[PDB]
A paper describes a structure:
We report two cocrystal structures of a mutant Ralstonia solanacearum lectin (RSL) in complex with the recently described sulfated terphen ­arene (STP3). Ralstonia solanacearum lectin (RSL) is a case in point with four polymorphs identified to date. ,, RSL is a neutral trimer with a toroidal, β-propeller fold. Sulfated terphen­ ­arene (STP3) is a large, rigid, triangular macrocycle comprising terphenyl sides, methylene vertices, and 12 sulfate substituents. , Owing to the sulfates, STP3 has high water solubility and a low propensity to self-associate (as evidenced by 1H NMR in D2O). We then turned to the mutant MK-RSL, which contains a Met-Lys motif at the N-terminus of RSL.
Residue numbers in the entry:
A (entry chain A), B (entry chain A), C (entry chain A): 0 to 90
Amino acid sequence: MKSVQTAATSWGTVPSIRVYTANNGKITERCWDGKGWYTGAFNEPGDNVSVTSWLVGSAIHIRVYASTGTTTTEWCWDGNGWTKGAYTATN
Amino acid sequence: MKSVQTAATSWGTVPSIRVYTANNGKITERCWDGKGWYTGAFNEPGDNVSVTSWLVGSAIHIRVYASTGTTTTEWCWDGNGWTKGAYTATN
Amino acid sequence: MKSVQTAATSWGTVPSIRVYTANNGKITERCWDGKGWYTGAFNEPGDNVSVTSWLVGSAIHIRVYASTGTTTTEWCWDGNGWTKGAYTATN
Ligand SMILES: OC[C@@]1(O)OC[C@@H](O)[C@@H](O)[C@@H]1O
Ligand SMILES: OC[C@@]1(O)OC[C@@H](O)[C@@H](O)[C@@H]1O
Ligand SMILES: OC[C@@]1(O)OC[C@@H](O)[C@@H](O)[C@@H]1O
Ligand SMILES: OC[C@@]1(O)OC[C@@H](O)[C@@H](O)[C@@H]1O
Ligand SMILES: OC[C@@]1(O)OC[C@@H](O)[C@@H](O)[C@@H]1O
Ligand SMILES: OC[C@@]1(O)OC[C@@H](O)[C@@H](O)[C@@H]1O
């Protein structure tokens, strides 16, 4: 057994918070935006996770780097669902 | 034996930096703000750590997600000491 | 065998993205800035990695915290190559 691994990001004034947790090979997402926490749409395989986000005006963009073994898959939020990104690692 | 795990955040112009380190089940905090590094008030159990921070005007708010096993505790800095937050994980 | 560990940061409008990956004791860096991913100059030992970045005007500053065992080395980007920073951990 082992500890889960998390990554977090935030934006805005309230603020909006996203916390990604890698738990036994699966990454899920929890969301805060002023009231209580709730579960987000992100759900992808991964043993390790990192995240970064940026704003274009008021629109949030999120990149989640999910790693299983030596394979890191980037997942992209740009307002309309999660999609796989072009990220590949060195060599 | 194993490697420590860290998380970092920063704000401002100098800037101010916070680095959280999980070392053998305990998370401590180091701080930079223009001169040298010094130890911060955050000290809580955890094998894994992540962090995010945001500003309201000039006031910094920090959220540290500390995980021991499958249990993740959120710790909140809002100007006046660290307090436990409402975060819980999916299901 | 084990999974790689990553950290990510971003800045700007395009945006610019940096992803650091600790893979079998070595951390390398991948970069995005509007077209495709390419390999960055950062290459240092480490089993765990975290990152934070900030802007001074339009100039990016990056701090990468590389941990091997209980030893965490800070690496600094301030526009002109990576250099070791003053970071040390508690006690
Ligand atoms: O409001 C929740 C949500 O839509 O915010 C953007 C992303 O975090 C999504 O995965 C998530 O479902
Ligand atoms: O819109 C998707 C995308 O282009 O966004 C910027 C980078 O995250 C890329 O890897 C990714 O494919
Ligand atoms: O100046 C250090 C400090 O007060 O900054 C806010 C938090 O990082 C605290 O834990 C820490 O003691
Ligand atoms: O002020 C504390 C709090 O409400 O801040 C926003 C979120 O981090 C919540 O989980 C947390 O309880
Ligand atoms: O454009 C790539 C680059 O110069 O950007 C700043 C740092 O990420 C460097 O390691 C990297 O080579
Ligand atoms: O310019 C280097 C430096 O002073 O930048 C701020 C902190 O990251 C310090 O540890 C580091 O030595």
